[PDB]
Structure formats: C-alpha cells, structure tokens
Write a protein that binds this DNA or RNA. Structure first.
Lengths: 80, 90, 96, 108, 96, 79, 92, 109
DNA sequence: TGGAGAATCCCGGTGCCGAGGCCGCTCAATTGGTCGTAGACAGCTCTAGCACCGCTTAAACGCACGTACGCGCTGTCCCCCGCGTTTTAACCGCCAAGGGGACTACTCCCTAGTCTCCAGGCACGTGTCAGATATATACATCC
DNA sequence: GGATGTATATATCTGACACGTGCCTGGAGACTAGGGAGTATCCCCTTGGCGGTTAAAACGCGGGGGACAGCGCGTACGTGCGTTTAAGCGGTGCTAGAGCTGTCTACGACCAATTGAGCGGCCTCGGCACCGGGATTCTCCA
C-alpha cells in the first residue's frame, strides 16, 4: 500500500525534462501520479483479463502487449 | 437482413407506448452491427492468441469484459451467463 | 558558484532527450504494478519482462503527455507547466 | 418429429440466436463456433440495445415526443458515461450536440 | 433604435444551433467541393446523394468537435476570441 | 475554386454549434483548409474503395468504410 | 518459434554491408513486420468481405497498401509488389 | 522423378519468404481462399518497408559513429521521416527515446 | 430599478406522409443422426518467480536563499459584432438522355487437398570484435 | 575574463553479435477436382438544364469590449549542499506453475428433410411539423 509515493518527484522531473519541460509547478506531481495510476489501472486490468482467460496465474509480457494494443498504444520490442 | 424487428421487440418490452423512426432504426441497426463486429473480432483475436480454433461462450465473456466499461460489462456478463444457463438447462 | 535558474534545466533536457534509459526506478514501479494488480486478481505472478513492458509504456505515455502539457503552457504564454495544462491535453486527446 | 422451438425461445431472448450463429460462421472469425457463444452474444446485444432504448425513450418523453428520433439516441448515448465511453469515436447522423456553454462565456 | 450588446445574439445563436439537428453548410456548394476534391483523384466520377450527405454529416461533426476543442484552447489562454493558434494547438494535441 | 462556397456564416454556424462566442477574422481560411484536408483524406479512401469494386459511383458505404478506416464511424447510412 | 531475423539481416546486408544489428533492434524489426503484415492482411480481409469475395488476390493487397501506407511509401510499395508479381509470373 | 526444388521467393527476386506469408495468410482466418500472387505481393511490400527502415536506421547509426543499429537509431529512422512517423504514429519503440526538441520560447536569449 | 420592445413559450387547428400492422411465400433456421477431431483432464518436469539477507552507494530528501516568473491591474485602440440594405445564387419543381449498377448464365481456370521428400531454417556452440569504461588535453559555453 | 561541461585520443576488457554445423519439418513439386468469378440486357438513378422566388450571403457603417502590451509585486520553484535511505547487485533457497505429452470423449461441422419466421408489398390513420394568436420571460436603457 501507498506505493504511488515511490514514483518520486525527481522521477516526474526527469520525465518532464525528457518531454522538454523547463519549469514545473509543485502541484504537477500529484496530478502525474493520478494520471499514471489511471493508465496503469487500465492496462493492468486488461492484462489481468488476458491472463485469467488463459487460466494462468502469471501475467506475461505478451499479455501487456495485447493490453496496450487494444488501447492503440502498440509497443515494440517484446515479441508483439 | 436487418435487426429492425428485434430492436422493435426490445423497444416494446422496455417502452410499450414509444415508437421509433426509420433513421433511428438505421442507427440502432448500425450500433448492433458495430458492437457485434467489435466483440466477434476480439473473440477471434483471443482465440488466435490462446491457440484455439473455437469461439466458446468464455471467449465472448472475456471479449465483453475487455470491450465494455465496468457496469455495462458486469451486467452484460450477467445476462450472458443467465441466457447460457437457461439454454443449456432447457 | 551558483548558476542562473533555468540553465541546468536546459542541460537536463539535453541529457535526457539524448538518452534511452528508464527514468523511473524499477522497484517502486514494480511494487506499484503489484499494488494495482492486487485489486483485480489476488495472488498473481509477474514476469520481469511484463513489468519492463509496463514501465516502457508508462514512461512513453508520460513523456508524450508532458510534451503536450509543455505546448499547452506555451500557448497560455507561460514557461511553467500546471495541472490545468495536463487536464486540457487529456481532454483534447479524449482521456477525460 | 417434434415441435420446432426457436433457439432464442429456449434462451429467453428476443435477438436471433440463429442469425448471430450464421454471422459468426460466415464472418471468418474462427474455424469453429460453439453452441453457447451465439446465445451469450445475443444476450449481450439485447442488453445493450435495451440500455440505449430505455434512455432514448426517456429522452423522447422528456421532449414530449412519442417516437424516437436520432436526437434522442444521441442524448441517450452521450448523457450516459458508459455509453459515451463505448461510442466515443461514433458519429450519430442527425444527432447534433449537447447544450454546453462554458461558464466564462455567460454574462455576469 | 434598439441594439443588442455584443454577445447576446452570439449566445442566442449558440443555444439555437445546439438545440437543432440540421445541417449548417449549404448542400450544393459542399457537393461541388466534393466533386472538385474527387476529380483530383479520378476523373468522370459519379456520386450518390447519400454519399454526399454522409460526407457532410461527418465533416460537420468533425468541425463542431474541432471548434469545441479550439474554444477550450482559447479559454485556456484567458480569451473568448478563437484564433488559428487555438485550432493549430487542438490539431497538434490530437495528432492531426 | 468551390472552397469559397464554404461561406463565413456557415463556419460561424458551425462554431455556434461548438459553443464559440467570438471568432477572429482569420479563422475562416484555416477552417476551409482543415475541411479540405479532412475531405481529401476521406474522399481518397472512398475513391480507392470505389475503384477496387470496379465502379464509377461513390456510394454511402464507401464513405462509411472510409470513415471507419480512420476511426470516425458514422451511424445512419448502412452497415 | 519462427521469426524474421535472418530475412531482416539479409535485407540489411543487401543495403548496408558493413553495418550490424542488435537483438533488441531485431525484436523491434520483427514486431514491425508482424504489425504491418497484420494490418495489410486485415485490410485485405475487410476488402474481400465488403466486395462479397472469398479470396485474397494481389488486387486486395494492392488496395490495402494504398489504403494504409502514406503516399510515396504506397507508390513505391505498389511498384515493388507489381514488379515481384510480374517476375513471379514470368518465371515458371 | 521430381525436379529441383526452387523457392517461391527466388522466383520473385525477394528475400522475404513467400511460403511463410502464404501459410500465415491461410491460417490467419483472413479469407476462405488466398490467391497465388497475394503472398508474393505482400512479401515484396514487407521487404520494401524493412529496407526503408533499415536504410534510415543505418544512416542514423553512421551519424552517431556506430556500426550496429540499436533501438535509438530505429526511433530516429521512424520519427525523422514523415511517412514512417505517419505509419507508426501509435507505436512505441522500446529503448527508443525521443527526438531532441527544445521550444524556441524556452531557449535563452 | 421600472418600462418598452424583442424573443420565446404555450394552445389550438389543419394536413400530410410515414410508421405500424396484415398477408403471401420463400428461404433460412430447426431437427436428427453421424463422424472425427479439438480440447478437457491427469501428470510430470524443470524453469523462472518470489522471499530474504548483506553492503555500498547513487539517489532521494530536507532546508536555505533569491531571483525569475505568474498574475493582477491599467490603458488603448483595433477588430469583430450587430444591424439594415442590396445582390446573389441556393432551393424546389419538372423533364429528359443516358451512363452505369444490379441480376443471371455458363464455362474455365485457379486454388484447396494430398503424398512424398528434401533442403531451408532453427537450435546450439564458440571465438572475436564493437562499445564501455578510464584518463589527460583542449575546445565550447556561462556569468 | 576567469570558471566548468564536454569533444578527442589512446588502452583494455568483455559479452553479445555472427558464423559454422547438425537434424527436422514445413515448403515445394506433381496431380486431381470442383467451385469462384470473369465475361457477356434492363430498369433505377445520376447528371444536366430552365424558370421562379425568396432566403441567405455580402457589404457597409458605427461603436464597444476584448486582445494585447507595459508594469509592479510577492512567492514559489531552481539550485546548491549536507544527511539519510533504500534501490541495486549478488547470492542462496525453495516451491508454484508454465509448458509439454498422452488419452479419450464430448461436441461441433455437415447433410438431408421439413416448416414457420421474417421480408417485401400494400394499406391506413395518427404523430408531428407548421401557422396563427396570444401570454411570459428577458434584455437593455433612462
């Protein structure tokens, strides 16, 4: 529990620097944590549905690949 | 071949004093065709993923769970299971 | 001494747009993935490659969102990003 | 033989099980199609049809109309969060848009 | 004489055109625009009436959605007036 | 030059339907360009679907398939 | 398990002789080939179903390439496919 | 009795397998039948697209003074070309990074 | 804030065309039996996943300072909204030529199916070359 | 004009890429069979034109309100430095369960006959669009 604080403020800062952001507000980090939680909830929910259809108890990389391919967020490099 | 009379039957089951126009019937027929294509394509894809050549009711159930949002998916799985249970026992 | 406020941010932009490495540390993201997955199915197993796929997708999504957030803040004649820029970008994409 | 009973009748459904079965055969989805999959999919399509039609009839009753026009279907789909999420990349013809003026445009 | 303040007739038009279902662009100029766009791809091409109506409905829905996103981009910049920078911002965020 | 038939009051009405209160004077040229780009993208796929079927008439289903091709699905013209 | 690794390596040595490739880049290339194959085959299947045909010919693949691939890419891909089909039919 | 076994790719002048594409089209549940020229055409299109990606990836590797193509070079190859970015708009390349772009309003005067 | 006037809502009458119901009939769904194979089920193996521990160290965290920047306020002037008038051409009705979509028959060639077999491709093993790293010199920026 | 971040050049290590070899299995050759589609009048319907008329668009003018530039201020991020803390790497241990194989049996494809459900066509009457009159908000100005 409370693992959303493990996505630290310097990690969000580094992602913003990769996105080209020069200056960041202090209220950005909670919003980014909520955005990341919503995105991960959607993708992990789809991948859990995929791995429970196949009668497995293990979530594979291909399950995540199809979960992202359903949402139009196709990811290369994992056998997709 | 259209879904017009079945949509009319569902409408008279739900709203017995309310009719429907021709353009609204065309839109509802297109909706049924689109949702059918979505669920059947997802079921075909999930059969191809798990090395199966058969679309069972489990494939349609997990396709409904993947496509439809939460309460709609829960209810649609409920009437699907109810209809399959009624069909097998009778 | 002390550099001016903004130049180290520009060097951070140059050294993080030149690199490919994962900006989020592996163990907190992995624990977040198993915390989210516990709400759907109990007692799950996770491959390492599944968590790395989730991390690559999440980092790409957040970097693209921060790009749209940056250009939203520039449109409002600002160089500082705010949560309203994130909310506007998520509305225009259709995520909200 | 015996009396010919419809597969939709023994499933308690109004949508055709046989037509959905023959569309799953001829749609080139899989090599084989099970018995309970058309029953499940007909139940799902009947439920979603009833979900749109109930809110469409409520919207037609709100506008003092006996029949359902496309404007009522657009109100029914877009006013429900799950139906707007399901049909977010769908344009209803002759459907219009909702009344939505932002608060900064109204006079003070 | 009698003169309404600027914005009253605009809000009245907003309520009137958001209540209605009708097509807003004239039919025959749009039909000529469809044929001059299609003659760049294939000469001596005929059109059903329903095809032109489908194009007009899709184009009007696309333009109304784009104008909604453009309006929110303009409100984001503390403005009521929409300029081309708002449209360019909306098509940049959507990916067009 | 029938892009000028997409008149400025028509663009004003489309902005009124989108809830736009006040409109600049350079909006109309950009809206005509956006409409031309969108109509070119849909009409090119519709012409491709017509030419595959070996026909001279663009049908409503060609437009519906062209709009479903880039995720702009239209309900009310068949399917 | 089958992959396009030797084929991508053959094309790479055909176009860049003194240039190698890594395993992750080869996995991305394999995923790219699979994605493009699935897209063109699905569009050809939709074209066959819309025109009430039960076969996929070179015409359906050509129309799918024109519908999916952008302009100059589509033109050069149709040229390459037509050249390969003419070379395949000329040689028995 | 039988003649010499010549592959279908060598008759087409291609490097991608015609036979594998024919098998994947037949078992992919795409249509009831698959024509003879369709795997040849599809293998040619896939080989051309692979050649375009590998052209721009090798140029990106040469510009960074490296004789091996990493995913960063593939990301540069796809995103630096307009048509390949249009083809791969909804595609995320793992270990690919981003293009270096800093807005002009953020740069110092 | 009261009042004039404009826009809008409500009520009633009228006509129309389209939705809804009825009927013949044909064609697609139903029924019953057969057959072969996909998949449920049991079992086993060994692979990868989870839990724990030490350490050392990069990175996160907390705090202090100050300066860049968001934001509110003010002025101004220009550009767009509102409205009356004139021009334009869209819309409706009607009428023909005529290109072209839809149906039908037949006949042929293209493609599924099968047997046999062999060579391309996959798995495994090994040496060896391309980055990564470390350090001194000097070029490029920073304030 | 003095102080740091980083090209640039030379040595060394290492591990992952690439090539060689052996089996094996899936593609290819040859043949047959049968059915999909390619090619050869008819009525819908698409385009082209004319006339009236009238709704909408273009145009011009006035003015008002909103975009935009300048300015001050106060605060909240950036940057830097010292302390802490837990990520990361390496290693061990163990146990669930992913994946493969074998058996057999239930279930879905398939075919033939039957028959009723749904579809095209046709007829009818009522829901709704429209027009006119009059009452009810509703905005702007003195």
């Amino acid at each position: 529990r409370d693992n959303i604080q493990g996505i630290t403020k310097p990690a969000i800062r580094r992602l913003a620097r990769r996105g080209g952001v020069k200056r960041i507000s202090g209220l950005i980090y909670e919003e980014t944590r909520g955005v990341l939680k919503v995105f991960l909830e959607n993708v992990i929910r789809d991948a859990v549905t995929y791995t429970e259809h196949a009668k497995r108890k293990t979530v594979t990389a291909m399950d995540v690949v199809y979960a992202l391919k359903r949402q139009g967020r196709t990811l290369y490099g994992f056998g997709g | 071949e259209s879904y017009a009379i079945y949509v009319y039957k569902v409408l008279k089951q739900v709203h017995p004093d309310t009719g429907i126009s021709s353009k609204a019937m065309s839109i509802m027929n297109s909706f049924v065709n689109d949702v059918f294509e979505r669920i059947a394509g997802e079921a075909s894809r999930l059969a191809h993923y798990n090395k199966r050549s058969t679309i069972t009711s489990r494939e349609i159930q997990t396709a409904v769970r993947l496509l439809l949002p939460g309460e709609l998916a829960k209810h649609a799985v409920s009437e699907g299971t109810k209809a399959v249970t009624k069909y097998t026992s009778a | 001494h002390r550099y001016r406020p903004g130049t180290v941010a520009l060097r951070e932009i140059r050294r993080y747009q030149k690199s490919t490495e994962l900006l989020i540390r592996k163990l907190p993201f992995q624990r977040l993935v198993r915390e989210i997955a516990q709400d759907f199915k109990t007692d799950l197993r996770f491959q390492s490659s599944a968590v790395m796929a989730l991390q690559e997708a999440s980092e790409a999504y957040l970097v693209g969102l921060f790009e749209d957030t940056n250009l939203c803040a520039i449109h409002a004649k600002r160089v500082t990003i705010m949560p309203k820029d994130i909310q506007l970008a998520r509305r225009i994409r259709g995520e909200r | 033989r015996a009396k010919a009973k419809t597969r939709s009748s023994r499933a308690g459904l109004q949508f055709p099980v046989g037509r959905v079965h023959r569309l799953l055969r001829k749609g080139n989805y899989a090599e084989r199609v099970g018995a309970g999959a058309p029953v499940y999919l007909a139940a799902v399509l009947e439920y979603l049809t009833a979900e749109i039609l109930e809110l469409a009839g409520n919207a037609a009753r709100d506008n003092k109309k006996t029949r359902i026009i496309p404007r009522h279907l657009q109100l029914a789909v877009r006013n429900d969060e799950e139906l707007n999420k399901l049909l977010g990349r769908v344009t209803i013809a002759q459907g219009g848009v909702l009344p939505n003026i932002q608060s900064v445009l109204l006079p003070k």
